[PDB]
Amino acid sequence: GRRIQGQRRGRGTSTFRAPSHRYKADLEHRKVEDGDVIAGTVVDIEHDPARSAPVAAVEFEDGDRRLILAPEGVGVGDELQVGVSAEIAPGNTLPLAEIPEGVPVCNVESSPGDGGKFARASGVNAQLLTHDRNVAVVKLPSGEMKRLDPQCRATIGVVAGGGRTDKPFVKAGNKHHKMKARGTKWPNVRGVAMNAVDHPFGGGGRQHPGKPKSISRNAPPGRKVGDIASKRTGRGG
RNA sequence: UUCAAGGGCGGGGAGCCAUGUGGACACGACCCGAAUCCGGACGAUCUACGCAUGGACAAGAUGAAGCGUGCCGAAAGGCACGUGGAAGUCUGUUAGAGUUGGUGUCCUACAAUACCCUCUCGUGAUCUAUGUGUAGGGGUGAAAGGCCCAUCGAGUCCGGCAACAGCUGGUUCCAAUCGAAACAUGUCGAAGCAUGACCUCCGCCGAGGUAGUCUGUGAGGUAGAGCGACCGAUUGGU
RNA sequence: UGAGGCGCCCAAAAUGAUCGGGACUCAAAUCCACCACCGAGACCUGUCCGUACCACUCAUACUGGUAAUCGAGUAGAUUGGCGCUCUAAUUGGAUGGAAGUAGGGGUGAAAACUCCUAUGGACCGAUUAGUGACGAAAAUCCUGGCCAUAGUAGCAGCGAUAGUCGGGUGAGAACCCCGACGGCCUAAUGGAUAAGGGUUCCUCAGCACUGCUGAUCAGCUGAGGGUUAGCCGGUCCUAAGUCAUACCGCAACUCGACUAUGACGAAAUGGGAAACGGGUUAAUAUUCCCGUGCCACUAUGCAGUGAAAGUUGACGCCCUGGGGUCGAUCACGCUGGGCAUCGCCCAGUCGAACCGUCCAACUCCGUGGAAGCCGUAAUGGCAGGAAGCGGACGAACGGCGGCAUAGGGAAACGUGAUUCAACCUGGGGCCCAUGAAAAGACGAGCAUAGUGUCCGUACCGAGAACCGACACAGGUGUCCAUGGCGGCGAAAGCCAAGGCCUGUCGGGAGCAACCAACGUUAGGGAAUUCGGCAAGUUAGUCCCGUACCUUCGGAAGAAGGGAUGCCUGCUCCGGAACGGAGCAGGUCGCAGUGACUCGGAAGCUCGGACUGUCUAGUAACAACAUAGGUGACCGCAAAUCCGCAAGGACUCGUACGGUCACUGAAUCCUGCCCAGUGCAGGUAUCUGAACACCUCGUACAAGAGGACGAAGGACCUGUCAACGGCGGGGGUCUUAAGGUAGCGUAGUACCUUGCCGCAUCAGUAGCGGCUUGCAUGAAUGGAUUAACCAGAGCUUCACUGUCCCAACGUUGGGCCCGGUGAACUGUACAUUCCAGUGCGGAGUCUGGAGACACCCAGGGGGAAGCGAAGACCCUAUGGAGCUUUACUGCAGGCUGUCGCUGAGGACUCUCACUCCGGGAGGAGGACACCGAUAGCCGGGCAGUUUGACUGGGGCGGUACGCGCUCGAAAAGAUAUCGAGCGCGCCCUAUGGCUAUCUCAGCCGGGGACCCGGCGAAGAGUGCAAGAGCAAAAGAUAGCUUGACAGUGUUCUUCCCAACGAGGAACGCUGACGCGAAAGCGUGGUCUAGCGAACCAAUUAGCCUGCUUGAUGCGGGCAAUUGAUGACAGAAAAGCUACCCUAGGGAUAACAGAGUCGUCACUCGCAAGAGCACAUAUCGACCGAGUGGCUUGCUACCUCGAUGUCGGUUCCCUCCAUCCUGCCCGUGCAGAAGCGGGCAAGGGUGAGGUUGUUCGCCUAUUAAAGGAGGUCGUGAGCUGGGUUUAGACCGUCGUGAGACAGGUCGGCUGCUAUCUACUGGGUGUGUAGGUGUCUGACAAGAACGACCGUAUAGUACGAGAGGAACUACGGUUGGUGGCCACUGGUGUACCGGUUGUUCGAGAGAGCACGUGCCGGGUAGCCA
């Protein structure tokens, strides 16, 4: 047979890459010596081509000009602060330790100082639940309880652009334009619509998969397709 | 080998070398003949998909939201007219792109995919130039096994290479003698082999031989016949 | 009355009859005898040759002899010889002419040798012994040359049909030049360029080459010449991205990812310092020249201390206002031209870069002070301050002044305006889409001077300069989109400017047939056809008006109805237009969107929701995509994926993510099943590898066992919007459940043209209903559904040459002439036709018939025409792509163990190692990673296998190893998918010996038992069948283990006749059993019951292992057991319609051929019925046949191809006759029939469903017969069906994929050499002429059929009803001819009229070969 589409992807050819050269900024938390004296003013609100959501242009006291993962409720003129003794309001960034429980937070770090990893897409937010000297339980948007280092910095508020998924693309053209700004090959041809040579589900005189769709985790690339290690399938039960 | 017996192999000196020649096996193996498989290279001037930077789309039609004015109403709002100018929107040989029917013309062509009429799209998932990326069990693919320079169910070039075939074709001077087998046994064997039958040639042996007939001593159950002779069929009558 | 001979009836086939033909009758037939002849290479005979043998001989040299008992031959074995090359030895020829070549003479059976003449002009032989790239008719053989083809095809076809008359030059002119007339091109056939080409550019001189003809011309040939830059490009900058170096990897590199650095990366078309005007050359030109201007740098001088913040470069899509130049147009003036019925029409009326100046818009400031005003095309603005007023900043490639008594013009050398490309400047809207960067510039003055190198620059830029082998009808980017009329228009049509007559061969025929494009056709109007394919109809604009349905958008231009020009005078909107909307009156035509441009409309059903995608080159579709729905994986040191590694994509991303899949808009919905399979989770117990550990073993080791036990598995649970399933039976069973909503004869329904209805004259169609559904059904998605569609089917109106049924015309060919000039094809011969024969499909064989030769044109009957080593089918121990629970392996994932790896069966720590963090430092941490190994999963990938037999192959079967009877032809041998049927064991006795004994069955006496008799065998003997057996081979009893060990002979296996294992018969040696003994026992009475090498285990003795001894553990001689049943032994599954190759007519489909069971038809007998009556009519059983249409069988012909079914068109035939003519019978009154005979002249038609043939149906008819010609007819047509590649549905399958199921789409090559015929000529023969005839023969259907009237309301008949002979009139079909008449044509002609151009008028051109409309002569036609 020939290599399946999932294998072509790995090669990182043009068709599969993201238009990085068009992307604006690698939104990461600032590196403050300590103290927390660092603050800045929201100079503008831009569209982030990589996340289909707003990103705030900020200018810091030390001259530094950098874009940022803007949560909802931030506008031009607003003063944002970053540091251990930063104020407890939307747009400000401080370790989960200095953050009062029950307060929605976004752009949470995994390892303190990594710049933020969790909850960064439109509308989402984590949820600081439990405190400690060692751990700070945070409920990620997927609903998982993530035990974290209290030193992990995070931003107060829900990520801006909420509700994006509510309106349907309606037409292929709209999907086309979105897809064109991501690292994804689109449209999608169904495996069952290909030839035996092209995909494990290909072939036949009619369209249906050969074997059952649920594939073992141990399956090799070229075969791992369909329902990957499904714990169950369907809706009933 | 063997208590034993019986068997196997060997034994009363002919070889070695050379030259010519018959035949066998390995090798290209009398010659040509095809689809492969493998290696290293050369191709994205075609084309597929992506990217960068540019360019293109007469004219008309329909008239979304929003806004306005007016009437009605306590309000909510509603109705009318106007404004507005949305759309993978419509008409359109604008440019440009595509390719449905004619199964027309052509079919040693104008052309190794052409001509004419017809037909579809024509502000978008649009078309297009140039630059640029992806390379061969690998790309690319809105998927047809499509496309990757007239080459694709695995490109092209050279090499491995004089690939192998039990399959088709061909294998060049004269004469004299003998003269088949198209069968048997085994065979992944039945389009092939080996071993026999049969053809030929050579050396050896040394007096018989037997294609015909008659007679003698034997073998035999086919034709025919018959079945109160077995066997099994198969009519009727007192 | 019996028998015999010969004949007769029975007796039907397709191009032209036959005994080979003629033809034959007291035979030239037949039968019985006879006589004589002809007739082979046989037989006889003369001579010769070869071969064999004999005598003589050294001899195979001579000579003599023998052959009645020698003389054919494919494959093949054997042997003597001819010829070629070069070597050697011996020996010769040649300039007094070698070799070769051409023609000719002689020898040899022959290969071949040799001579003569001519040519040639320098080499050439012989004998012997050697040598070898040593002998050709063939291979779709190779290379070269050449003939026919043939003076043939092409040099016509394209919406660009282009020329003509004069003249010039010249040896020569249709096409080279000049003038005129006439045309063509308008986003191109014009102008400027990119790539690419590369000198093609210009000049001179030429024509051997090239140029579709010619050429004096040329992109050709030769020689010269030609490209000038500070201000156009490059150059510089950076883009997607590329490379180089370092680092790292790799066995290694010219390899490889990341991270650094550097460099590269844009000539039309990214960014960017600066040039305009005129002039000039044969050829350059923002480059040269004249004039004027500008930029950068540097130097000097003055100014300036500012100088880096910021601005710029610098940016998406849609709508839109304002500013505004060119252009165009309008008014008017001037200059020049044109026209001449008028007073119109055309051209010009010029003038840059640059310098200076002006400024709308936006932004802002002051003033002011709106509580409702301001403002816009629109949105909008405001007490947070609206209008107004003043002001700051601030635009054009624009205005204005200079530039400029510069330039340019023959001259005048204008002025206003409107609409306004360019250019400038604003406002609004959209994004699940956010629309480069860097260099540079600005910021930041002025004078004067100096410098400004290097590379490109010609020309083409395309129906001749590029790519496509070509001067190729193809392909190929940019700018000119503002030239006039027209009109909505960058549309058509017409015309400027500019270009061209080079989409480059001509001349001639009223110019025939035929073909390509096309115009028009009366009446009818889809009757055509698979199907309205093709064509046609409709059309522009305004007014009125508009259904079902609908997702409320749409449907919709629904449909339907009306209007439409010109002229005169006006109104309204607007600032106005040379803008738009209307009014009144007048008025012409057949026609006013007058041409051109320019929808045909309506309805039902199927499918996919829609726009979109696709098989470059037969599929555009229902297929892919899509939004939408759904499930799965993953918290990022992730899931998924790429790399060998170093590393990488996703990712400048983070669950509202992105990966992996299914379904495929909206709406209503989406049932039941977890047994199998998959995936996932759990798990007491069971199973589960290696290391380590324990035991045995070994002075060690191999090795054997044990304990512990991971993932995995067993087991359990979860899960179907996972793969998939949703029946049989009865009022449960397989295997989990047992089909719910819906839909249903479906693109799924075999039966099937289902039934009913609608519709039609008629409807395998279509729609609706029913529906038991061969074999519908829910995200393998079910149902429904508006809109959409080059998608499939059907209906109606309209339309029409699709048809009835064809005609005429137009243009280009075609035909003739000049010039140019191929190809395909060719074993040979060839004037054939009818029959026959033959490998069964002959121009060539056989018999006849016909046939004088050559040539022109034609349409293609035949050469199983030409073209392609058949795609179909089978075969090959062929190939490839694909699949899987085929075989074997390889990646990869999971898991244990070892190493890295450290301190203190569960736990702490830090110090390696990893990651985060700039770092301090944090997280993690002996784990992870990495290296190694083990177990599991593992078509992700690789190599392969997947047998043979066979009335082809497959399915089935096994005639694949064995035994018996028969087949089998009285020895032996003997085939078939031949007939009957068996064996793959069983038995410790069912073996062995001995003793005693005789059985089946029947009878008689007291189905057990006892007694007698008859009883050669029918019993019994393990199991087929055949055979053997009676004091036994059977029965009973007793005893016994010979079913023993060893080694042979012979036969068999395998006749003859080689071959293994196996088997048997018969010995010997040893040991035994039984018997008095002879003797019997080498298993079972005989013929079936069986298996090699390698390896293991097993039995007993011995041989043996590398200097040597001991021990362990090995190697071996002999034999037993373990299986290969495909049974003389491989370890082994499938699909291909995506296919590929080698071959086969060794083998299937189609056609032919044989057969004829089948089928069609007939006959013999005649039961029976027909009210009686076999035979008017019907007709069984049985029996005998004919045909070659069906079907089947066979495997002869072709696989280096004989093109399919159906249809069509055109021709001939058969008769078994449907009609028509003439007859016979009748259950014949008549009329109408029924049955039969002769008879093939003619006729046998039109339509509805269906691809159909067939068949069903309708209405007409005299009747609407059947069949043959390769199931006649594809070098004739068509292409609906079968049967390629795409796709769907049902069924089947794990799957690829399949189907003798359905469905949508899906290509039709060739220039005719021969032959054949239709027609036309030229010659020869008969043997200079003119005119007229004859008639051997040949062709015809030239005529076939019907209706009507009189006969006649007659004959006949109760009546109803109702004939004929004959005579007439017409119709239909066929045929031949003709055009007065009717009709068509009529691009002859005349008129009307639209647009445009020539100024108007007059008169004309174009609008495709007439713009359109109306009329239409001749001719040709129906």
Ligand SMILES: NC[C@H](Cl)[C@@H](O)c1cnc(N)[nH]1
């Ligand atoms: N294939 C098995 C062989 Cl032929 C075996 O039977 C045998 C017999 N003789 C042999 N030499 N080999």
Ligand SMILES: [Cl-]
């Ligand atoms: Cl998305």
Ligand SMILES: [Cl-]
């Ligand atoms: Cl000889």
Ligand SMILES: [Cl-]
């Ligand atoms: Cl240039």
Ligand SMILES: [Cl-]
């Ligand atoms: Cl505005």
Ligand SMILES: [K+]
């Ligand atoms: K064939």
Ligand SMILES: [Mg+2]
């Ligand atoms: Mg990031």
Ligand SMILES: [Mg+2]
């Ligand atoms: Mg992309």
Ligand SMILES: [Mg+2]
């Ligand atoms: Mg899809």
Ligand SMILES: [Mg+2]
């Ligand atoms: Mg497919």
Ligand SMILES: [Mg+2]
């Ligand atoms: Mg596969």
Ligand SMILES: [Mg+2]
């Ligand atoms: Mg499907």
Ligand SMILES: [Mg+2]
């Ligand atoms: Mg499916």
Ligand SMILES: [Mg+2]
């Ligand atoms: Mg390219």
Ligand SMILES: [Mg+2]
């Ligand atoms: Mg409007």
Ligand SMILES: [Mg+2]
């Ligand atoms: Mg559109």
